[PDB]
């Protein structure tokens, strides 16, 4: 298991830290569909390119799954 | 483990957080069929375009197990 | 483990929520071959096209699984 | 984790179909025996598809048959 | 974990129901090598046929592994 | 859990069912390097055969981690 | 599991080993969608070029499975 | 789990079966990379023909494991 | 589980072997991105050459979480 | 589980069995990088040639995190 540190002391770190409440304000956003991943898309005979995608339905759905858990 | 936050909280947070009832709502949505999701599709000689298909089986048939569990 | 929400509060929710039988009715479809999946289907040269083709049996044996279960 | 379970008498009397325990069996019985068909996409040149009809997968019996093993 | 039905109502089943010591005869036709699968061949230029195949060692061994704990 | 049979079960059932010694037997063959299995080669422009080669270095690993659990 | 490792000999240790605290603010950054990785892209007929693409989805939500964990 | 047979009925068995020294002596010639696998290799144009390769890390680590736990 | 050997005894060993610090270090090199991985690159009509890449985000993220139990 | 053997029966049997420490030697190789593995790699038009490359990052950190588990 994941060692567990005081809620005070995420806060009060230099660097960003999320907390518990931030981590499912993150975890909707996806679910709700409002999020993008960045994918390889051919463009002709073997090239590629950059594009940005909505998240698919089998990563929003680990994402609800893991906000009716919490 | 995920952290279980109260409802109440989840309530007044500022930035949206889904609420367990919510989750099921959207879960329904996915095994209803009435959901899609955006995948690459080819259009020849190697090149693709986005576009959008229903909700795979596997994807629908995940959401009914969690929707049979809750 | 998924959050139980009383099923009268499923029942009152003003967005559609499946019951459990419900769940049960959508896998009885899917074990029994009545339903369908969206694929891309090649059609030459790279090209594809949006079809319709029956749930896979892995699908189907996974419905079979879970109804055997509930 | 668990499925719910509904007594089989509302099974029974619900109006739309629900399969039962029975039921449930006798379909991952005829996958086990090699009776049934799934529908896949099959290659006919150059790219281009046609649906077909294939017989049930070695690894999908072989489900099936641990299913009924565990029932 | 699967409903657990009586052997004598398997029995009695108008319709076929494996009965224990059945899944475990079909289990062991697949362990000896007897059975055979259907699966797509190419044939050229990305055309394919249907043709029969033995069982890969990998189901084999799962077989094997079932019987083993049997 | 697979149901286990009794041994004197298996000896009279009608179809053969492997006893627990010939499971092992059979494990044994395949992490000797004795067995084959049937695959598709490839043999120009897409077009395959059918043809047996070893049984793969996974799968005799499996093989040795059942007889070592046995 | 993993053996344990004393905080205060992370600290003393010569060289680096990452303390909880950092642990948690490089999942962060993964899962407020501020890194990238390194991946092979297709320019045309087999050949390929590194380039820098942004962390896909499922490795944010695995990175924001463990921050709610924690 | 797999049955376990008494090593003196392994010993009297007429057809080989492995004892459990033998296993750790299989796994440890895989483990020191004395051990090779059947693969398809390409020769132009789609065709293939067999060859052996050395067995991959991933397999030797998978013996390795299995040996330290026996 | 693995057989536990003692640390004192790791230490004289004549051949190298990791210490549960030495372990970690190497962990924390990989999460904090310091460390490549060879890989083989497509340079032109199937041709391939070796080349280093950055380690990927999924076995950083592995890392992370290692570090984070232990 | 696999079958535990004392390693005095390891040291006197004719045929070389790794012992605990002899593992962790092979293990600690593989996480340092000090390790190849032989691959297929493309030299054009589908042909392929035998060559080493350095084991892959993933099987790395399997290692690591099996020697940090010793």
Same mark, same amino acid.
């Given at each position: 298991?994941?060692?567990?540190? !005081?809620?005070?002391? +995420? &806060?009060? =770190? &230099?660097? @960003?830290? %999320?907390?518990? =409440?931030? /981590?499912?304000?993150?975890?909707?956003?996806?679910?709700?569909?409002?999020? +993008?991943?960045? /994918?390889?898309?051919?463009?002709? @005979?073997?090239?590629?390119? @950059?594009?940005? /995608?909505? /998240?698919?339905?089998? !990563?929003?759905? +680990?994402? %609800?799954?893991?906000?009716?858990?919490?």
């Amino acid at each position: 298991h994941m060692a567990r540190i !005081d809620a005070r002391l +995420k &806060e009060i =770190n &230099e660097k @960003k830290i %999320l907390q518990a =409440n931030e /981590v499912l304000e993150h975890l909707t956003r996806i679910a709700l569909g409002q999020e +993008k991943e960045q /994918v390889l898309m051919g463009i002709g @005979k073997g090239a590629e390119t @950059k594009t940005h /995608v909505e /998240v698919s339905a089998k !990563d929003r759905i +680990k994402a %609800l799954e893991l906000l009716g858990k919490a």
